[PDB]
Write an enzyme that holds these catalytic residues in place. Structure first.
Site, PDB file in Angstrom:
ATOM      1  N   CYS A 228      -6.477  -6.452   8.695  1.00 57.37           N
ATOM      2  CA  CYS A 228      -5.503  -7.254   9.465  1.00 57.37           C
ATOM      3  C   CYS A 228      -5.414  -8.731   9.044  1.00 57.37           C
ATOM      4  CB  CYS A 228      -5.830  -7.170  10.953  1.00 57.37           C
ATOM      5  SG  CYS A 228      -5.108  -5.847  11.840  1.00 57.37           S
ATOM      6  N   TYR A 272      -3.527 -10.948  11.935  1.00 55.69           N
ATOM      7  CA  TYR A 272      -2.118 -10.524  11.880  1.00 55.69           C
ATOM      8  C   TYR A 272      -1.102 -11.613  11.555  1.00 55.69           C
ATOM      9  CZ  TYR A 272      -2.944  -5.569  13.484  1.00 55.69           C
ATOM     10  OH  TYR A 272      -3.394  -4.292  13.635  1.00 55.69           O
ATOM     11  N   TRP A 290      -4.038 -11.685  16.822  1.00 48.80           N
ATOM     12  CA  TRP A 290      -4.679 -10.367  16.901  1.00 48.80           C
ATOM     13  C   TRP A 290      -6.197 -10.490  17.023  1.00 48.80           C
ATOM     14  CZ3 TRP A 290      -8.091  -7.419  13.763  1.00 48.80           C
ATOM     15  CH2 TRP A 290      -8.233  -6.060  14.169  1.00 48.80           C
ATOM     16  N   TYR A 495       2.590   3.127  10.906  1.00 44.84           N
ATOM     17  CA  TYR A 495       1.652   2.023  11.092  1.00 44.84           C
ATOM     18  C   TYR A 495       0.527   2.066  10.079  1.00 44.84           C
ATOM     19  CZ  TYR A 495      -0.691  -1.717  13.747  1.00 44.84           C
ATOM     20  OH  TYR A 495      -1.219  -2.901  14.168  1.00 44.84           O
ATOM     21  N   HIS A 496       0.351   0.935   9.389  1.00 45.06           N
ATOM     22  CA  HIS A 496      -0.655   0.725   8.339  1.00 45.06           C
ATOM     23  C   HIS A 496      -0.279   1.255   6.957  1.00 45.06           C
ATOM     24  CE1 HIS A 496      -4.111  -0.119  11.422  1.00 45.06           C
ATOM     25  NE2 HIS A 496      -3.367  -1.187  11.202  1.00 45.06           N
ATOM     26  N   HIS A 581       0.846  -4.343   6.886  1.00 48.83           N
ATOM     27  CA  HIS A 581       1.542  -4.397   8.177  1.00 48.83           C
ATOM     28  C   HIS A 581       3.008  -4.826   8.103  1.00 48.83           C
ATOM     29  CE1 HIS A 581      -2.670  -4.386   9.320  1.00 48.83           C
ATOM     30  NE2 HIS A 581      -2.328  -4.184  10.579  1.00 48.83           N
TER      31      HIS A 581
HETATM   32 CU   LIG Z   1      -3.302  -3.100  12.147  1.00 41.21          CU
END
Ligand SMILES: [Cu+2]
EC number: 1.1.3.9
Length: 639
Positions: A228, A272, A290, A495-496, A581
Site C-alpha cells: 500500500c 495509499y 490508510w 482490487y490489487h 491500486h
Molecule cells: Cu490495498
C-alpha cells in the site's frame, strides 16, 4: 488460497507418462485421488537425475482446457516441490508449440494453479524446470486439468490474451526495471497476505521477458513492508517506494545495480497516497490516510540529490478530498497526480475538484475548476484511472471509478482534460460516449500509438471479492474519439491488480487479491498483445528495427538521431511505469516530430520543457506505415 477458473475433468480414462519414477512413487500416483500418495522422480539407489522433469497426460478425448492444478506432497517434506515450470497443450502429443503458461510457484505445500485462456487439446504436459529449493527431484501428490463450458475463437483484429505467467506472490504492486527491462513485483511480508505484519520485510519477484525467468528476493535492508505505498521513478531513475505497512519509510530501488537502498523517512506517516515525479526530478506526495493514522496530511517533497524529505504544509490536502462515506480514511487516497511545468503537480481527481499544487517555499494550492463537460459535473471517481497520452498537448484521459472506495457502483464516465499553464483552469470535455463497461479497480496503460488500453475491474467495488467482473478490455483511440472493445480474458482482475507497458509493446496485466485464506488470490499475470503487432493474415507482423542511436542520454530540447532497417512513419517516447491500486503517475507519452535525413535515417527533438518531458527513463518506439511498432530502445532524459 486460490482457485481454478474451470471445472475438473474426469481422470478415469487418462494415460500418464513421467521421465522417471521411484518404485512406490509411480507416475499414476499423481492421479489416484489420494492426497497422501505422490509421484517422485528417481532418488537413492536409482541416482538423483536433476531437472527438467516431465509429467504428460493423454486425456484420450479433446477438451476445452483452461487450467491445471498441482497438489504437492502432503507429508511435511519439501523434496520435489516444483519451482520454475512450463505448461504445454497438444492435439497429437508430438507437437507442443509454445507454453500456455510458465513461471514459478511458491515454496510451500499449498495447491498451485496455472489458469489460462481456453484452448482445445487432448494432451497436457507439465515441465518442472527447477525444484523450489534448487534440489534435483520433482514430486506431485495430485494433478488435475480443468475445462471451460465452451470455446469461442478470438475475434480477428481485437488483439490476443496469452500466455499466463505463474508467480510465487500476488503482484499487488509493480514497476518496469529500466536498465534490465524486467518486471519488478511485490506483495507484503507474505506472498499472499498483508494483515498481521510485523513490518520490516517485503517479498519481491521479477519476471524477465527475454528469458521467461521468474526470480524472487526478500527485502529487509530497507526495513520496509512496501504494501500500500506511493510509487515514483525519480529523475535519476531510482524507484521511490513510500509508506504503506511501515507508514514512515522510504525504500529506493536502483535498476543499474539491481539493489534496494534505504531512503530517508517521510516527514508524515502515510498509506495509499500517490506520489509524483516533478520537472526537476524531485518527488511530491500528499494525503494517504490508510496507515500512519487518519488526519490532515498535506504535501511534502523528496530530493534525490540530498536524500531528504521536506514538508510543504501550505500545499493543502483539503481541496482534493472526496466526499467518501468512509471519511478521511479513504478521501485522500490515490490522487490522480501528474508532474507539470515549473515544479507544479496537477491533481486531476478523483475528487470532482481539480487542483494545482506548487512546490516553491512551503507550498501552495490553487483551484483548477471541476472535472466536467456538457453532460454535467463529474462525480467523485475513486479508483478511476487517469492517463497522460499526449504530454505535448497536455492531454489526460480519465475514466471509471466510483463515488466511494467500496460498496459503490462504478460508472462509465470518461473525460479529456487539456492542460495549459500552471494556475489556469484546463478545458475538459467528455470522451466519446464513455466506457462500454462501468468499472472500478481497473488498470490502464498508454500504448505507442497514443491509444489507451483499459482492462479488468468490477461494476461494483467490493475489495477482495471477484463479483461483477469485467472480462472485456477497451481501447480509446484519440484521433477518432472512440472506444473499442477487445478480445476478453478469463481471469478476474479487481482490487490489487496491476498493468504495465512492456518494452516489447505488449501489456503485462496481473494480480488481484492478497487476502490470505481467501480463494480470490491470483498468483499470476497475463500478456495482452495488441492488434498493431498482427498483420491481416492473423500472424505476428514483421517489426521495424532501430539499428543505431546517436545517444542514449539526452537533455530536454536536445536531438537524437537514429538509423532503422526499414522506413518508419511515426515515433513516440513513453516514460517507464510503476503501478499499484490503479495508480501510475510515472507513465506518459510524447509524440515525436520526425525529420527524415534521407533513407532510413531520422532525427527528433525532445520537448524543451521538463514539465512535459519528465526526467528519467523513457521507451523509444518507432512505427512503420502499417502501424507496427519496434521494440523499445531505452533513453534517459535530463532537465
Ligand atoms: Cu490495498
Amino acid at each position: 488460497a486460490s482457485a481454478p477458473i474451470g471445472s475438473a475433468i474426469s481422470r478415469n480414462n487418462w494415460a500418464v507418462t513421467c521421465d522417471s519414477a521411484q518404485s512406490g512413487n509411480e507416475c499414476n500416483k499423481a492421479i489416484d485421488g489420494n492426497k497422501d500418495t505422490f509421484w517422485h522422480t528417481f532418488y537413492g539407489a536409482n541416482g538423483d537425475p536433476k531437472p527438467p522433469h516431465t509429467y504428460t497426460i493423454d486425456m484420450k478425448t479433446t477438451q476445452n482446457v483452461n487450467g491445471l492444478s498441482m497438489l504437492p506432497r502432503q507429508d511435511g517434506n519439501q523434496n520435489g516441490w516444483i519451482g520454475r515450470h512450463e505448461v504445454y497443450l497438444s492435439s497429437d502429443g508430438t507437437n507442443w508449440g509454445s507454453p500456455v503458461a510458465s513461471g514459478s510457484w511458491f515454496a510451500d505445500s499449498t495447491t498451485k494453479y496455472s489458469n489460462f485462456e481456453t484452448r482445445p487439446a487432448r494432451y497436457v504436459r507439465l515441465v518442472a524446470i527447477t525444484e523450489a529449493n534448487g534440489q534435483p527431484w520433482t514430486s506431485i501428490a495430485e494433478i488435475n486439468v480443468f475445462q471451460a463450458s465452451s470455446y469461442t475463437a478470438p475475434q480477428p483484429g481485437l488483439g490476443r490474451w496469452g500466455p499466463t505467467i505463474d508467480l510465487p506472490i500476488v503482484p499487488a504492486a509493480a514497476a518496469i526495471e529500466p536498465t534490465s527491462g524486467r518486471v519488478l513485483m511485490w506483495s507484503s511480508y507474505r506472498n499472499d497476505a498483508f494483515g498481521g505484519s510485523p513490518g520490516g520485510i517485503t517479498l519481491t519477484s521479477s519476471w524477465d521477458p527475454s528469458t521467461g525467468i521468474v526470480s524472487d528476493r526478500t527485502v529487509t535492508v530497507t526495513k520496509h513492508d512496501m504494501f500500500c505505498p506511493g510509487i515514483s521513478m525519480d529523475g535519476n531513475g531510482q524507484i521511490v517506494v513510500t509508506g504503506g505497512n511501515d507508514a514512515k519509510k522510504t525504500s529506493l530501488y536502483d535498476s543499474s545495480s539491481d539493489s534496494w537502498i534505504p531512503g530517508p523517512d517521510m516527514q508524515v506517516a502515510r498509506g495509499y497516497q500517490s506520489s509524483a515525479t516533478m520537472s526537476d526530478g524531485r518527488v511530491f506526495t500528499i494525503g494517504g490516510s490508510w496507515s500512519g493514522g487518519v488526519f490532515e496530511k498535506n504535501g511534502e517533497v523528496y530530493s534525490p540529490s540530498s536524500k531528504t524529505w521536506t514538508s510543504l504544509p501550505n500545499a493543502k490536502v483539503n481541496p482534493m478530498l472526496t466526499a467518501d462515506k468512509q471519511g478521511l480514511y479513504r478521501s485522500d487516497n490515490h490522487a490522480w497526480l501528474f508532474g507539470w511545468k515549473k515544479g507544479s503537480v496537477f491533481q486531476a481527481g478523483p475528487s470532482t475538484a481539480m487542483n494545482w499544487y506548487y512546490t516553491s517555499g512551503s507550498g501552495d494550492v490553487k483551484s483548477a475548476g471541476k472535472r466536467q463537460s456538457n453532460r454535467g459535473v463529474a462525480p467523485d471517481a475513486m479508483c478511476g484511472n487517469a492517463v497522460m497520452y499526449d504530454a505535448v498537448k497536455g492531454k489526460i484521459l480519465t475514466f471509471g471509478g466510483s463515488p466511494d472506495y467500496q460498496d459503490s457502483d462504478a460508472t462509465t464516465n470518461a473525460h479529456i482534460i487539456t492542460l495549459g499553464e500552471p494556475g489556469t483552469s484546463p478545458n475538459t470535455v467528455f470522451a466519446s460516449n464513455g466506457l462500454y463497461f462501468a468499472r472500478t479497480f481497473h488498470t490502464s496503460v498508454v500504448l505507442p500509438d497514443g491509444s489507451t488500453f483499459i482492462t479488468g475491474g468490477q461494476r461494483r467495488g467490493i475489495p477482495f471479492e471477484d463479483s461483477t467482473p469485467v472480462f472485456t478490455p477497451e481501447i480509446y483511440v484519440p484521433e477518432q474519439d472512440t472506444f473499442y472493445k477487445q478480445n476478453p480474458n478469463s481471469i478476474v482482475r479487481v482490487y490489487h491488480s496491476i498493468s504495465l507497458l512492456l518494452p516489447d509493446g505488449r501489456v503485462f496485466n496481473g494480480g488481484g487479491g492478497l487476502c490470505g485464506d481467501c480463494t480470490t488470490n491470483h498468483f499470476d499475470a497475463q500478456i495482452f498483445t495488441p492488434n498493431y503487432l498482427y498483420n491481416s493474415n492473423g500472424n505476428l507482423a514483421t517489426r521495424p528495427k532501430i539499428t543505431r542511436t546517436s545517444t542514449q542520454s539526452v537533455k530536454v530540447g536536445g536531438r537524437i538521431t537514429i538509423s532503422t532497417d526499414s522506413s518508419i512513419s511515426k515515433a513516440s517516447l513513453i516514460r517507464y511505469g510503476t503501478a499499484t491500486h490503479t495508480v501510475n503517475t510515472d507513465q506518459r507519452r510524447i509524440p515525436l516530430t520526425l525529420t527524415n535525413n534521407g533513407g532510413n535515417s531520422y532525427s527528433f527533438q525532445v520537448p524543451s520543457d521538463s514539465g512535459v518531458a519528465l526526467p528519467g527513463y523513457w521507451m523509444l518506439f518507432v512505427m512503420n506505415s502499417a502501424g507496427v511498432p519496434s521494440v523499445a530502445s531505452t533513453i534517459r532524459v535530463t532537465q
